[PDB]
Write a protein that binds this ligand. Structure first.
Ligand SMILES: Cc1ncc(COP(=O)(O)O)c(C=O)c1O
Ligand SMILES: Cc1ncc(COP(=O)(O)O)c(C=O)c1O
Lengths: 319, 319
């Protein structure tokens, strides 16, 4: 049912575009210091510690066909991330939700990438008394972003297990805290391109799989799903994959996933908010179990997008 | 001869402060997109990938008593860092040097912290063709920053070996590439404060010392200097420490430094551009070999500041 999903998106894109010459927010909208402004014009202070030392957390809910998807899960993860970094969401949570909906309405964007950022503020942890630290908030709405483009999801992507880089371990930086410190992940993207592939899979350096440059990894083997427990973000897409699998009666094991399972499994897909369910059909230059998108991947694919119209996981925005 | 160095600084500081209310650049000046602006007013595009994914490198030379210290070393390290990250300094190096000198002069600042930042730009590595990527440059000059303030340097600070966090390993993020991804270092600063100390010493997760939140670590035992080789920034202050130690006939060992050596060494000091030579007299709540600043620390301290008037390591700015 990719045709239905992608055709609906192509149609809504054409409409969105024809608003660009008259709606200054049609290419994205940003919230900065309580003002709304076109995304291409948003500026932040050079001295903000979110920039000076990437001292921040963030989270990215999405809108599809005018329905916010699992927004409360994203806001709850954001607050959990903040707590773990000794940050505090600078506005009441219900007010933040209110602003996000309004921002989407003004943009007219029906399929949107939505980002919230909480930074330490203008005074850094080093030599500022904690009582004088004032956290900052930034939010923006932009057109939906594809870690895997629709036309590649019909074909499958190519991945490698990275050998020149490995994932930052939790004892250095907690990967359950969503953060913008992408040094290892960018190295991985460089390595995949050098090796003639699109996506990097990073190990934990101890012969287990973790995650990639903006996605969780799922292996399928003998009808069972396998996905890394430790060392990764606990994605909302992954959580939706788990909800779908259980509804379908497919076993899911969130556990230590040895690198070797990647070379003898039946299917592979990545999952993430900016793109959804993303099949992988070659691994280290070899077809994954024959090279075709697998049946369980397809079932999860359809179940994920179905959830976007399910009131238990979504709500409709008034534009 | 701390008295002379610090009293000279205090005097120049009183002059600078007296002008804060009439020189608009006296609190700092920034270069953004070819424009010079007061530092407190400088702003960068929200969508710059230096913010969105901390996809950048940086470097921090300094000015002392109107004399740039080792600027060409810092600029060469910046270019080497750019190369490792596949970035390119956006202006010719000699034009970059000329702008900085101009910026210091306009500010009137005689003791300056000078930062250069090269970011990926407005288009990210994920989903932009490399040929369409355009790196951005930001620079600023601000009053000299003290990781350890003069009064504390006369007496020594207190550190802990961090036990809730360890340093990001090189196979994840190269610590010789100066970067603003301080997730582990901020955790270290929190841990130190939680424990009633100031400075965190992070290990490599294999029982060896690395560096801290903005500084290298040097141990002194039986007349020999020891400082970690792998897993740390190759500090320009550390390079100056080595030049001074060789000048004095003191042996320096840049090698693997087991954590245990910190508990039985004779002296400890930190070194960094933002403060210079910073003695440590208590470790994990215990005195370091008596709790007094050691004689080899004092010799390195004096020689470090003497090098700031040596034409081989510095040049005078025309204000
Ligand atoms: C490193 C990383 N892992 C996993 C994910 C997937 O998380 P989620 O499904 O909540 O978007 C992302 C999100 O972009 C990510 O950046
Ligand atoms: C992590 C880290 N280690 C060491 C240093 C010391 O480098 P340098 O002496 O060149 O300033 C710095 C400087 O702030 C640093 O951030």
């Amino acid at each position: 049912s990719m045709d239905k999903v992608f055709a609906g998106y192509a149609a809504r894109q054409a409409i969105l575009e024809s608003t660009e010459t008259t709606n200054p927010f049609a290419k994205g909208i940003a919230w900065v210091e309580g003002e709304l402004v076109p995304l291409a014009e948003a500026r932040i202070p050079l001295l903000d510690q979110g920039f000076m030392h990437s001292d921040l957390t963030y989270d990215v809910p999405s809108v599809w066909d005018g329905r916010f998807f699992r927004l409360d899960d994203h806001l709850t993860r954001l607050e959990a991330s903040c707590t773990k970094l000794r940050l505090r969401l600078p506005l009441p949570r219900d007010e933040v939700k209110q602003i996000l909906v309004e921002m989407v309405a003004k943009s007219g964007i029906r399929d949107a990438f939505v980002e919230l950022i909480v930074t330490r503020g203008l005074k850094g942890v080093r030599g500022t008394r904690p009582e004088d630290i004032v956290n900052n908030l930034y939010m923006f709405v932009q057109p939906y972003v594809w870690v895997m483009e629709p036309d590649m999801q019909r074909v499958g992507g190519s991945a490698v297990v990275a050998r020149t880089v490995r994932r930052v371990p939790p004892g250095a930086i907690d990967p359950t805290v969503k953060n913008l410190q992408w040094g290892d992940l960018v190295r991985g993207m460089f390595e995949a391109a050098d090796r003639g592939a699109t996506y990097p899979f990073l190990t934990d350096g101890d012969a287990n799989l973790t995650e990639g440059s903006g996605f969780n990894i799922v292996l399928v083997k003998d009808g069972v799903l396998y996905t890394p427990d430790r060392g990764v973000l606990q994605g909302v897409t992954r959580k939706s994959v788990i909800d779908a699998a259980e509804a379908f009666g497919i076993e899911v094991r969130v556990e230590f996933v040895p690198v070797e399972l990647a070379y003898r499994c039946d299917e592979i897909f990545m999952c993430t908010t900016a793109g959804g369910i993303m099949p992988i059909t070659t691994l280290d230059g070899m077809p994954v179990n024959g090279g075709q998108i697998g049946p369980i991947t397809k079932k999860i694919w359809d179940g994920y997008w179905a959830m976007h119209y399910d009131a238990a996981y979504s709500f409709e925005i008034d534009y």
